[PDB]
């Protein structure tokens, strides 16, 4: 029940990543020539570029937005071992200005993500050496200053990370890390770290044993007040997992919360290496893209079972 259209946007080079703002009125796209462009939607519904500049010495992988409450902030990770933070200042032509650069990585910075709003202005970066670094800006009015708050070693090449968007008062912060190592040995590829208030340190909580193939993308789904967490894993086949916390005994509060892991959907319609996965706002529709040049939309049904609902092709031609 999904139809496609082509947006009249002109690009000269190959597009690596596209990202939306919170309200869905601003777009950020990174191209193959170390260039970043920002697009705005008019009241009529048309898109117009508003800024463009070159950022790093190496290739640019990912660019993401921050929450509007902190202003207009973009974060970009690059192959040249850097992660840059940009803020828009207008005096009206937009004039984006770099405010800070994080260079603590010893390998290529593979991915960068923003923390959920209710935890302040935090940022996370996973590198190729197996290191996840979490920074925080103590003052929201001075973005030029950042401090390295936490550092975690994964012993495997990190490839993607995702925060837990839950904002309940009973869920500790959670971050999940994937890997794309293709070692012949059968080793786990997805680990989850849960913050501990009693120690103020992140510790490993659960590791997905059933996942052994290289992983390219991992995505939590929006909580929306449910009683459990939904995770999506992109591999040779799209997989969906549900994690339910167990009732913590009041006798003693100890380490990480124990979880029950159940798989609820495993699709192999791409017949290739699935590359990207994403959720809608309500966490009820899953979008997946793989090497077959097709985009597939999955949704639940009356019987609470997962089945495909849409198939499209990269050219925009419907199937």
């Amino acid at each position: 029940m999904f139809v496609a259209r082509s947006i009249a946007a002109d690009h000269k080079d190959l597009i690596h990543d596209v990202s939306f703002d919170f309200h869905g009125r601003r777009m950020a796209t990174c191209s193959s020539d170390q260039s970043v462009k920002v697009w705005d939607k008019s009241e009529s519904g048309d898109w117009h570029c508003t800024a463009s500049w070159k950022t790093h010495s190496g290739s640019v992988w990912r660019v993401t937005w921050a929450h509007p409450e902190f202003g207009q902030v973009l974060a970009s990770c690059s192959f040249d071992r850097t992660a840059a933070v940009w803020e828009e200042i207008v005096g009206g032509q937009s004039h984006w200005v770099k405010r800070t650069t994080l260079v603590d990585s010893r390998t290529s910075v593979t991915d960068v993500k923003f923390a959920p709003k209710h935890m302040g202005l935090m940022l996370a970066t996973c590198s190729a050496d197996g290191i996840v670094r979490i920074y925080e800006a103590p003052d929201v009015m001075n973005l030029s200053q950042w401090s390295l708050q936490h550092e975690i070693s994964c012993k495997l090449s990190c490839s993607c990370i995702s925060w837990n968007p839950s904002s309940s008062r009973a869920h500790s912060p959670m971050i999940a890390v994937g890997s794309d190592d293709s070692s012949p040995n059968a080793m786990a590829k997805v680990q989850i770290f849960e913050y501990n208030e009693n120690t103020r340190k992140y510790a490993k909580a659960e590791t997905l044993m059933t996942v052994t193939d290289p992983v390219h993308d991992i995505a939590f789904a929006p909580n929306l007040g449910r009683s459990f967490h939904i995770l999506a894993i992109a591999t040779k086949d799209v997989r969906i997992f549900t994690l339910k916390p167990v009732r913590k005994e009041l006798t003693s509060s100890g380490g990480p919360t124990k979880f029950e892991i159940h798989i609820v959907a495993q699709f192999d319609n791409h017949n290739s290496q699935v590359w990207r996965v994403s959720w809608n706002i309500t966490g009820t529709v899953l979008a997946s893209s793989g090497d077959d040049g097709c985009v597939r939309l999955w949704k639940a049904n009356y019987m609470d079972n997962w089945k495909c609902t849409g198939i499209l092709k990269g050219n925009g031609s419907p199937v």
Partner: protein
């Protein structure tokens, strides 16, 4: 009545509200319903209908209300919020 209430609660069907009422059992039934379908608008509007003060003090009800308000803010339906 006990058996019917239990089998309605475990399934999350909304017709069981008549049985449980706006109590903790109603909260559990509504939570199951939300888990099944992901609708918070109906839950938020229902739970405000003259519910006892203890019911409104539950964490889950307020979490649903906050999520709905955030959803309204996302679509820029400011006046309706």
């Amino acid at each position: 009545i006990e058996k019917l209430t239990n089998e309605m609660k475990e399934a999350g069907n909304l017709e069981g509200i008549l049985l449980t009422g706006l109590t903790k059992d109603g909260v559990d039934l509504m939570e199951s319903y939300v888990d099944r379908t992901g609708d918070v608008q109906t839950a938020s509007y229902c739970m405000l209908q003259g519910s006892p003060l203890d019911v409104l003090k539950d964490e889950r009800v307020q979490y649903w209300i906050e999520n709905y308000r955030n959803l309204l803010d996302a679509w820029r339906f400011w006046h309706k919020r």
